[PDB]
Design a protein around this ligand. Structure first.
Ligand SMILES: [Cl-]
Ligand SMILES: [Cl-]
Ligand SMILES: [Pt+2]
Ligand SMILES: [Zn+2]
Ligand SMILES: [Zn+2]
Lengths: 477, 487
């Protein structure tokens, strides 16, 4: 990358009640003392913050690197002066950060950034920041945002862990097409949405039974019920509020229950037989969030701001109380790529060691299920130390010998992300980790039916015993 | 005052209708006793008041009652002129243009100012209301004046008679029971770590203890009701679009109670960078800016739950062998903007329902309803052992409601509604255009099991201590799981 030094520069003056004249001697010497003592704390040798110069007002220029940054050193200076002047005897002029980068960057529509100029070694930012913004650690977040943008300009890494021996593929139809023709399901009215008739529902329910009996029970997972409408509060706390916006379906409550407010809408429909979506948008409130997207984030409201007794971890829970929603890539797909899906979401919390242990245990169960019960062809891969996702992929014969495999299962180790995000401590004081694993029912079905067909006689014995006698569908004329 | 229509319009012509001022004038005068009398009792019938020509314009003023309305009257005079001037004059019409469309509607009272799509102004006058309409030729053929008239008459007759909508008749009531537990059950559950409030309005997160109770109820419904009556599981959609609610009749008035769903105007990350950057710097989500950036709503979150199912049978014909179609869904949450104030689980904005739906002939649909009551009776008396009643709310079209007392509410508090069986008549087959092979009328019913409602009633009556729950219920529950304890 670039080796240009990360530099902060601050020019401001302290608000003084009394006139800086008898203090002239006292202020000069204790700035010197701050340079050798106070501003060293929290920085490797020599890399401490520094006051370059100082002149009604007490104006100064202040310089730092990445440690003891200018905007937090000034508060260290504010408290030291307070005890020096008060008992005996902040207005910012400029804020500049210099940030290392190879490539040029665009001008950003970002709050608190007055100007952005490209320089030798990277970018120079000028911040529109006062006292409150500094206390709120705004420049740290601008730096973080800018660093994210910088390394993104420098632009997947996929690593194979285990693969099953190839098997024969006597069935080559698209299971969705097959299911449609045989009366298993139909397209729902919304995009990427399906209505499942008795036969398809049965498959979904049998996978559910499999997860419960072969995984969730033997490992001691307890059922909870997670909320499905998800608020900004949750997504702020989970981090989804940093970028999830393009993928979600937004939710708006009505501004009021008042019949009269809504009369114009009902009236419009009565006369035109058209829904006035334009007018309705005006009358609905701002979005409160969206429909369930990742599924686990809203659970963390259950433990938010709490301390778990060591007795209570590992916490091992799951949810299967409703639907998830994602705005997928346009153009139609089958059940392999839906907008409305049904997931069993599995969440575990404990120490670092316990989370890794739990992940490994789930991996063993998935292997048993896919090999011995479903008897499908699959592999797993890690996406590029233990923090990250392991993906399960399977070939869909109808896509041909060279087609993309389908992602149908995940296990994620999330580190301290969620405990930190939702503020969940452990009573012993050790750092809490978490993990999660989502069983996408549509995906299991897409994989199993593409490989095995819609005919129970050709399904593995172990699967047939769990389905029972298939129900009949709804026959039409 | 009397109901009357008023039209001012002219026929467009290719060539000038000038060489026909006598053949045309003799024709209009005839229509006032002949052409514009059919379909209306004598004395009543459309009439032309003013006559005027031009080099292309043939403007007329027409007045009528509700019989042979002015816009039907102009279509009688359209083809009459098309053959009188057809090959005998070489002049054909090119269309109809309207200057004014004015309607006088009788009303004893004064009525508020409403904004209505094709009404360009309304005023209160001597005998009722006047409506100035903004209609062309297309709007007249489509019955726009007729639907507007219909709308205003609905409002005039509602203002006169009020809002009479409460038909309640008790059917059966269990004998009073000893109520040893008088605590609000969700307040108890909160205190005992069974659940916590979710971030969203009227929303709850259920710890293992509460989830167990929900799943025990679900198990009971499956085993004691769905299986022995031969119901088949399906999976109904949960994002519900306008087209679905248009066909179910919800597009007529659910608006105040629904949670609206909006897609992003685009998937394009560059469009959303400003939102993301704003959040990352301020730690405030810019909800006002997001509202500008999302699309108009495509529908809402699941409200009644069965409507999205009907797209499965929409426009199909069912062989007589296939009926009754007995079906149920338990695939996710329903959402509703409830009347305000915080409540416990007895009244939530996010709930968990099992929606049971049956379709067949009128007789089969009554039969199926009858089959469910017997099963509900058995469940509520012999498993849950709760104090309950049921009542019809309004011949056979209507809902039977189950209510139970909540001891904490007092000796005369409101009983809680916790179960329903609805007979909807032909409403759903008609709205979704679903037919029977034999041509006999299809009917449907539904029954929604609200888990929060069952829990509220059961837990308020029997407490949270398993030792006090009925023997039948305890066996199905099994061993209670422990909760998650915080320091
Ligand atoms: Cl989510
Ligand atoms: Cl609905
Ligand atoms: Pt015509
Ligand atoms: Zn998760
Ligand atoms: Zn229903």
């Amino acid at each position: 990358g670039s080796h240009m030094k990360l530099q902060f520069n601050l020019k401001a003056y302290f608000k003084t009640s009394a006139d800086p004249t008898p203090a002239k001697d006292a202020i000069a010497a204790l700035f010197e003392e701050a340079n050798s003592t106070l501003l060293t704390r929290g920085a490797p040798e020599g890399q401490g913050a520094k006051v370059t110069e100082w002149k009604d007002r007490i104006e100064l220029t202040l310089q730092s690197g990445r440690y003891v940054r200018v905007h937090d050193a000034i508060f260290r200076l504010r408290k030291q002066l307070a005890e020096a002047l008060g008992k005996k005897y902040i207005e910012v002029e400029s804020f500049i950060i210099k940030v290392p980068a190879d490539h040029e960057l665009r001008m950003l529509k970002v709050p608190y950034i007055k100007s952005m100029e490209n320089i030798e070694g990277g970018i120079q930012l000028e911040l529109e920041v006062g006292e409150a913004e500094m206390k709120n650690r705004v420049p740290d977040r601008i730096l973080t945002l800018l660093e994210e943008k910088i390394e993104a300009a420098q632009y997947e890494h996929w690593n194979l862990l285990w693969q099953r021996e190839p098997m024969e593929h006597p069935f080559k139809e698209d299971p969705t097409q097959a299911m449609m023709k045989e009366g298993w399901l139909k397209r729902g009215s919304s995009r990427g949405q399906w209505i499942h008739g008795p036969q398809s529902a049965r498959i979904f329910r049998t996978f559910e039974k499999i997860v419960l009996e072969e995984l969730l029970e033997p490992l001691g997972y307890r059922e909870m019920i997670f909320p499905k409408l998800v608020t900004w509060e949750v997504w702020m706390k989970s981090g989804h509020a940093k970028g999830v916006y393009p993928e979600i379906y937004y939710v708006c409550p009505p501004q009021t229950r008042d019949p009269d407010y809504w009369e114009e809408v009902a009236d419009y429909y009565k006369v035109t037989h058209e829904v006035p979506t334009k007018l309705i948008k005006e009358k609905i409130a701002e979005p409160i969030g969206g429909m369930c997207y990742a599924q686990c984030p809203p659970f963390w409201m259950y433990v938010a701001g709490e301390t778990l007794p060591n007795e209570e971890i590992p916490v091992k829970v799951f949810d299967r109380s409703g639907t998830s929603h994602r705005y997928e890539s346009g153009g139609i797909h089958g059940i392999e790529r839906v907008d409305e899906f049904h997931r069993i979401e599995i969440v575990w919390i404990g120490t670092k060691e316990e989370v890794l242990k739990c992940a490994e245990e789930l991996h063993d169960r998935y292997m048993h299920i896919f090999n011995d019960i479903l008897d499908i062809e699959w592999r797993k891969a890690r996406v590029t130390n233990t923090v990250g996702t392991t993906d399960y992929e399977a070939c869909l014969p109808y896509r041909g010998p060279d087609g993309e495999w389908l992602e149908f299962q995940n296990v994620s180790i999330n580190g301290d992300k969620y405990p930190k995000g939702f503020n969940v401590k452990l009573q012993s004081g050790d750092e809490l980790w978490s993990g999660c694993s989502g069983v996408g029912l549509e995906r299991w079905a897409a994989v199993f039916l593409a490989q095995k067909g819609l005919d129970p006689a050709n399904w593995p014995e172990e699967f047939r015993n769990r389905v029972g006698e298939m129900p009949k569908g709804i026959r039409f004329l």
